[PDB]
């Protein structure tokens, strides 16, 4: 049995082209665990970029061609073999059709409002009884978790459901605002430094960021809050960070294009340093799983059970983190103690970890 498509009842909340937004749900009435997954797939930051994205990647701007069902995979699978600890959860997949990194409140950009509305609807479909809501996402979805997790928590508190413990899982959503390897002029989504892209995007989307983070940067420089290492310290909700040290999307936005052939020296240096700098941004994030691999996303992939860091698989790391937080309480000195933490590779090159996926 698959997750089932539901289109949002409030007609005013929509995808980019005005088609209604929605979510896929597979219910598990015997569980009080809920997993809400935010899909990724870039963004567009002006009319011409978005026109071009409407022609090439229409699925990411529209619900028109969404199938009625989706099989749950990886962390959204209900098979124990594929999802050893959380197979019995209530599963929600929220398609990305807002092109705005889940920040939005001609084309409509409503990503933040979509999430708000999904949560509101799920309260009437069993979520009012939950013990745990894990807000998870990959790529622009991972970044969306960072931008939305505290707002979801506040939304539930304010609606009078304070007992639902809200945590986040951000997969492939932790990027460096470093220099590119080779400067491009902001022309395309792939020819634009992430810093410039988000700065234009925010204004074009009327994007919002977490309030606490917004206050720590100059007025009008909210784009900082899209970068994990800047926003993470200001987060109230515990967030588990899953991040390949050599993320393909990070390479892409730094204008590195691999042929697979031997890499020149200037580019060897870039790669060595990316891994080093990424390791540095994570040194004070104990809920971290960061393998030395060149890849992109993991948590809804079927093979997410096969990657290991320091002898620990990702499902297990997550299950230990989640369980120990859940039982913890204000008197707890060290909540994560006895969990494997700081699961960050130190080796210096893509695939130095033998368990990387192909
Ligand atoms: Cl897969």
Could you explain the architecture of this structure?
The protein has about 350 residues and is an alpha/beta fold. It is built from nine helices and 14 strands. The protein has one domain (about 1-358). A ten-stranded mixed sheet has the order 4-1-2-5-3-6-7-8-10-14. A two-stranded parallel ribbon has the order 9-11. Strand 12 and strand 13 (about 310-315) form a beta hairpin. The longest helix has 19 residues, at about 140-160. The two termini are about 30 Å apart. Chloride ion binds next to loops.
Topology, please?
Layout: E1 3-7, E2 22-26, E3 33-38, H1 47-56, E4 69-70, E5 90-94, H2 111-123, E6 132-138, H3 140-158, E7 165-171, H4 194-205, H5 211-214, H6 228-231, E8 239-242, E9 246-247, H7 248-253, H8 265-281, E10 288-290, E11 294-295, E12 308-309, E13 312-313, H9 314-327, E14 343-344
Parallel strand pairs: 3-5, 3-6, 6-7, 7-8, 8-10, 9-11, 10-14
Antiparallel strand pairs: 1-2, 1-4, 2-5, 12-13
Helix pairs in contact: 2-3
Bound molecules: chloride ion.
